[model samples]
Target: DTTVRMMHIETDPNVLGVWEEIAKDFEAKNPDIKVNLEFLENEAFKAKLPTLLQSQQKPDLFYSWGGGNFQVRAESGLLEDMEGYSATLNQELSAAGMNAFKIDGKQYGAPYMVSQVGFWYNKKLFKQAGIDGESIQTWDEFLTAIEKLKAAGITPIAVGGADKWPMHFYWSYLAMRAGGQEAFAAAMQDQGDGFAGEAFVRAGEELKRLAALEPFQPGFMAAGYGESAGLFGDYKAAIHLMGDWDYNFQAQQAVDKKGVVDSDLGFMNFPVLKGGAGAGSDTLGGINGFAFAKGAKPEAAKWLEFFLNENSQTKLAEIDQIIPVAKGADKGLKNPFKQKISQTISSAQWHQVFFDQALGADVGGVVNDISVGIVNGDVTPKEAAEQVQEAWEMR
Candidate 1:
């Protein structure tokens, strides 16, 4: 008999309820295994995970962002080796779920649901601007799309730089759309000329150019994360460069419960920069889900399995309004975003974990700083590139 403790970093009531139901069902199936769950504010959970892990007091299972931090944990020998477990789960997961949990040849986590970063736009604003959402397929088209929104006096994008992480998504997606994963891998991994390379410099400049459009609300920097989500969901802005997580947020909207707004607000892949190394299929996504810590008892694996089970997967996919990383999960989803997500998962030729995961925590910090500098007009693109190069070289 084992008591497995788990921790998660979401405060949303609906999300918590879903996880709780999963936990209760898992415990019922394995009566000998008692599970304790803890929920904390995301920021607080992040601040506590590393310290708890180091102190050997962390929960038996917890959530982590795959890529850099997971890599570091892998290197540190703190994470349980789920490579074997991953192989079995993959065979059970839908074909699309295969790519969600992979990181550097290992499975460090299990994602119930996953999303890719992209542009979510306001339909009314686009209609008012006489813009067709379908016309946004290339970087030039994206610029034109934004220009139309601006001409119609609609903010083209919603940004909240009060927290640095919010802005990194912009630069990261830009890099992906600009250079694909190969270039992104080379630049972020400190290979060759590093961030000093043209690919890295150009991505920063592109982000700055987009920001110069003044597409965000007046106090964007002062806005918080949920505030940005609200801006796009409430039709206050024409675009939001974020992930499918917003889908869950929107599906739970109080005002537009029917298919009206959900049908109107469209999600299109990040446009490719013409002649750039990246393609339209290159997406910015990674897994952010649960993991079993090294010291957990064997029963922890049971909870992990239950979390990835077919019922859990279906509930997560349909309720969360995102694509489940477990195979057979897509059948339960009903949202338009889920359909788009399914298309992406089925069609994607290559996938890169979000830049933060790809770059790891330390290097991710450098990327974050440069993004803020660009948004504040404090650093030139060249300078930002050079700074990243310097940090990578020193690392």
Candidate 2:
């Protein structure tokens, strides 16, 4: 009995139910191979995986947000290089999704799901503050609205600092806005100071500028991502710069489980920087992926292929569970919010993955840490960018 163990951190019961059926169908077809689906709390899973990957008991298939760790694992021979699956995956998955897992020209995994992070604001709150969402097309203008929110006694933004990752959105998005495709590509290519380049440094200054408005909810520094989501969901704050998935999860975290009612909730692009070179259509987000553990048998690949197929992908979309990665699977998305996000990505001039994921674990961890430091005024913007560049150079 060949058992292919797969691990994940998904908490939605309905989503898991669909996955269970997919596994059952796969096993029914591949009679000799068994698929063992495993679940772990996200933090617990990340904590234990390092040793687990080195031990003999590591799961053959595991979740990968594809950052520093994925590169580290692949480079160190801790993961199976899935180059052979390229032809099929290249055809089935969107180019943006597949490229995220393709490191140094080798296919290490495939995108299980995709996302685009942006501002999720309360329309009523904005109206109460006498702010117009349509007019917040520039950074200076965004600052103007947040000031209005505060003057109206509404918190301007809610963030999770303790978890660290949530803080990267503002820092990185600002970087994308200021630097554009050319600045980031140059930095990534190690041209002219790398992450410490002008675009990144300026992003920090902008973040510092935002922090001065005292825009966050009280105790933001100690809050976890769930708490921050709840703050937004409970109507304690007017805006949440989060991903599309926040629509459901944020509501789930709220006291009512309904969040801001659909009529009052709105999602908008991260505002463009003043005189910034990045196209207004450029976006920042993620593509959570799946990679095979080292020495995994071919059945592991089959499971990934099965799970990422249009039927499975479309099923998740029908429930508005994800911005489906598979081509045509998006036809199933019925929610207006989900539909809008799909169009947002489709029309995007550039869609950069989350910095922490793109940078990988080691350096990305520093990015997360320093984001908190920068927010609290403990670190200068130039210092923060240099720290990331230094970490990248060291790694």
Candidate 3:
């Protein structure tokens, strides 16, 4: 019998239940293959993945963010090139989504989900602060809104500082707005100073301006993602800058299983920087899925195809577990938040993956550290950009 081991960082029971069902169905179809699914916490999975990838006990397939990390793995010969096998398998999925897992024209895996990062605000708190969520379209307007929230004795934001990547979002998104596609492309192409260019330095300066307001919840630096997410879920903070998955995570982490209801929760795009080079419609987010490990059984590929099929992808969408990549599967999204995110992504002119993941681990770690340092006043904008450039040079 062929044993196919699958690993992922999803802890939501409802989502896992659907996966379990799919595994059962796949096993029944292919009686000779046994599908084994394993779960790990997010940070733990990341911390251990490198070693795991090199070990003999590695799973046949594992979760992947599909950027620099994926590139590193592919170059190291640790992953399978799925192009020949997946060519006809995922023809129904969005080409953009599939391209996220491709490196140097080789398909390494398949993408099942896509997401966007933005400010999720509490409407009731915004009203109390006398701020209009929809009207805050520029960075200056967002700063004004923050000031109003602070004056109203409300915490303007809740951030998971212990997990530095959560804080990295501000710096990364600001850089995207300040630099646009050209700036990032030039940096990636190893132009002068690379990431140390003017755009990145300016991004750090803008983040520092926000940090100066003391916007986050008290003790935020000591809090992890789950704790900060819970704070927002309980309405202790006026806003949170995070991915769409926060919708489910906040509810699950809340003291009561019911978090701030949809009526009180409002999703807003990240405010655009005035005169910034990036288009207002450009987005920063993720396209995530599974990649096959080296030496994986052929059944692993078959299982992946089955898992990402139309019915399976639609089921995930119906449960609000993901923004499905399979064509025609998005019709299952009934939640207004999910629907809005799908529409926004569809309309976005540029969809950049999360910088921390896109830059690869060595450089991505520097990005996270410098982001936190800048916000904490430990590093200057110039220093932050220089550090990132230095790390990229070494990488």
Q: Which candidate should be chosen as best, given TM-score against the real structure?
A: 3
Stretches of candidate 1 off by over 4 Å are 82-91, 94-108, 250-260
| Model 1 C-alpha lDDT per residue in residues 72-131, reported as the tens digit of each score | 786787777667656556666544444444556766556655668787777778899998
Better of 1 and 3 by TM-score: 3
Off by over 4 Å in 3: none
lDDT of 2 at 321: 79
- What number of backbone clashes does candidate 3 have, counting pairs of residues 3 or more apart or in separate chains? 0
How do the candidates rank by lDDT, highest first?
3, 2, 1
Question: Which lDDT values do the candidates have, in the order given?
Answer: 0.73, 0.87, 0.89
lDDT per residue for candidate 2 within 1-395, as digits (tens), equals 79889989887667889999999998998898899889987768877889989999888889998876887888998888778856767888888788878877788888988788989999999999998887788999999999999999999999998788898899999899999999988877777888999989999999899998989988898898889999999999998988887888787889998888889988889988888988768888878988888887777877788889899999999877799989889888889989988888889989888888888777888888888889898899999999999888777
Q: Which ten residues in a row have the lowest lDDT in candidate 3?
A: 81-90
On a 0 to 100 scale, what is the lDDT of residue 346 in model 3?
Answer: 83
On a 0 to 100 scale, what is the lDDT of residue 220 in model 2?
A: 92
